Design a protein around this ligand. Structure first.
Ligand SMILES: Nc1ncnc2c1ncn2[C@@H]1O[C@H](COP(=O)(O)OP(=O)(O)NP(=O)(O)O)[C@@H](O)[C@H]1O
Ligand SMILES: OC[C@H]1O[C@H](O)[C@@H](O)[C@@H](O)[C@@H]1O
Ligand SMILES: [Mg+2]
Length: 280
């Protein structure tokens, strides 16, 4: 669809984005389905279509809410959830509903849908995830980083499983730009652990207390760092999974280089995933 238009369901053609009056008069809210530091999300209906209605939680998270909306408007593509309508005044966003929901439900979903509970389909799932990262790193709005991914469940929370079994990014609230000398930080609070990239950890030791003003900024390689965790989750433990992990060890090891500049690009990881896929 051209910029500003959407298509879903049995729509053969593209319709303009809905506005405040259409959301106020034509959408019937059905039941809560998610939440949400920024949005409260409701399964809803609009004509024959199930849609998601995301409502701003607190007029204080407002700034994060419009960022995701602006990201959503400019980043429409096969990799992002379809934007249907929005209303800034009401702090609402309308998008295509995906009844399989969060990527977290993958294992639950794959038991009906076991024509696709194979290693081949899971690895293709993993290739779609990397394709999104590659798209975000080369987006209409420049290189964008999927900042809100400090642990596996939270990272998966941000993507949806479509009924065809593609993946799309959904939550784009935290999407800083990397560029000029423009680097980024994922929040203002100290990050800990091994899921975040090591350059996201405080670098100055226990004898220097954390000060965000001293925390050095970083770039889109923090997304590369997290690829093997998402890929491994998607492969799961069905026949062939460990065979695929074996062939992915080294590309995944390059994804965990302590030195960010040594990690591959998303395009490199995708390329290697494809070669491994067709070889097996
Ligand atoms: N279009 C949709 N179709 C189906 N389920 C959805 C849809 N949008 C959101 N949900 C569900 O509701 C949740 C909404 O979370 P999300 O949009 O990430 O809100 P949020 O406030 O930004 N959460 P956070 O990650 O803390 O910033 C998702 O993780 C899904 O479980
Ligand atoms: O919840 C929003 C906030 O969450 C975490 O602190 C980080 O991952 C940030 O990038 C993000 O801005
Ligand atoms: Mg989220």
């Amino acid at each position: 669809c051209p910029p500003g238009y959407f298509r879903m369901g049995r729509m053969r053609q593209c319709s303009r984005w809905l506005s405040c009056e259409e959301l106020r008069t034509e959408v019937r809210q059905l039941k809560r389905v998610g939440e949400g530091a920024v949005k409260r999300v409701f399964l809803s209906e609009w004509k024959e279509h199930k849609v998601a209605l995301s409502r701003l939680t607190r007029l204080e998270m407002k700034e994060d809410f419009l960022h995701g909306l602006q990201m959503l408007k400019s980043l429409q593509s096969e990799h992002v959830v379809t934007l249907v309508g929005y209303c800034e005044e009401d702090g609402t966003i309308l998008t295509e509903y995906h009844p399989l929901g969060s990527l977290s439900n993958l294992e639950e979903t794959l038991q009906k849908y076991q024509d696709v509970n194979t290693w081949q389909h899971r690895l293709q799932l993993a290739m779609e995830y990397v394709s999104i990262i590659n798209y975000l790193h080369h987006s209409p709005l420049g290189t964008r980083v999927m900042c809100d991914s400090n642990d596996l469940p939270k990272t998966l929370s941000q993507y949806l499983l479509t009924s065809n079994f593609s993946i799309v990014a959904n939550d784009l609230d935290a999407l800083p730009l990397v560029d000029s000398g423009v680097l980024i930080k994922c929040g203002h609070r100290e990050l800990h652990g091994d899921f975040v990239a090591p350059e996201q950890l405080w670098p100055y030791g226990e004898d220097t207390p954390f000060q965000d003003d001293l925390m050095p900024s970083y770039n889109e390689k923090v997304d590369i760092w997290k690829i093997p965790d998402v890929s491994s989750f998607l492969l799961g433990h069905v026949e062939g999974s460990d065979m695929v992990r074996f062939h992915l060890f080294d590309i995944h090891k390059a994804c965990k280089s302590q030195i960010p500049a040594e990690r591959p690009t998303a395009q490199n990881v995708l390329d290697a995933y494809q070669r491994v896929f067709h070889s097996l």
